[PDB]
Amino acid sequence: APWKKIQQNTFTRWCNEHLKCVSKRIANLQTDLSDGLRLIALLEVLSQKKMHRKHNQRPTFRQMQLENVSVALEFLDRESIKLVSIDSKAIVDGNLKLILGLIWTLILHYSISMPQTPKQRLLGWIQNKLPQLPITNFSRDWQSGRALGALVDSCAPGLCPDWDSWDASKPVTNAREAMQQADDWLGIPQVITPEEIVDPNVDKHSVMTYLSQFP
């Protein structure tokens, strides 16, 4: 089923918004971080710093690749970023679930905490922007597309002035209007698509990733 690939899709676009700065790309999150080059580049963009150690520019062999990743994880520690049971080989060997967990950790830190739990903090920011709306979660509340219109308009009143009269039975249409307004006018990229964000089975962490760009 396609909703299972929403997290991977969303994390991949998020990663690519940052790798654009250093002219790099990820096509496949399972393979493309395994030599440690794109992971390191990503970290340098996110932290606006350089690594503490030299790495292997050309990690032709496995061992050089494990080294590269090990530099990256040492960096994460130096920066006091707590990693959830991740080792060099999990990344080099293409363990997708652990790789997704690593990226989620970077999103939480750099997109939510750095700019009470990260969830509570984002949720609270949104709640303050939308006092007339009982926001309690990062899935169902967002499914009609109307809360997105509300959020975009609170950020710049006049972008989606009529969100409140939007037809709740037009989720994709509502979401696209809101998200494209935020893209064109607030510079908020669509690291989740409108079709993905209103999915009955949308990954909440993916929704948080998208919304963490508003603050």
Handedness of CA 149, 153, 155, 158 (dihedral sign): positive
CATH topology for 1-115 is Actin-binding Protein, T-fimbrin; domain 1 (1.10.418)
At how many Å resolution was this determined? 2.3
| Residue ranges of the chain assigned to CATH 1.10.418.10 | 1-115, 116-215
3-state class (DSSP) for residue 83: coil
Question: Counting Cβ atoms within 10 Å, is residue 55 exposed (0-12), middle (13-18) or buried (19+)?
Answer: buried
Structure tokens at 26: 């990820």
CATH H-level, domain 116-215: superfamily: Calponin-like domain (1.10.418.10)
Residue 2 Cα distances to 11, 174, 195, 196, 209, angstroms: 15, 21, 11, 9, 19
**Alpha-helix runs per DSSP H in 134-213:** 146-155, 171-186, 194-197, 204-211
Which residue is associated with the tokens 């994709």?
A: 172
CA pair distance 130, 160, nearest whole angstrom: 14
Handedness of CA 176, 159, 210, 68 (dihedral sign): positive
Asked whether 88 and 94 are in contact (CB, 8 A), the reply is no
Question: Counting Cβ atoms within 10 Å, is residue 61 exposed (0-12), middle (13-18) or buried (19+)?
Answer: exposed
Angle (nearest 5°) at CA 180 between 212 and 160: 90
**Alpha-helix runs per DSSP H in 20-145:** 37-47, 62-78, 88-92, 96-106, 118-129
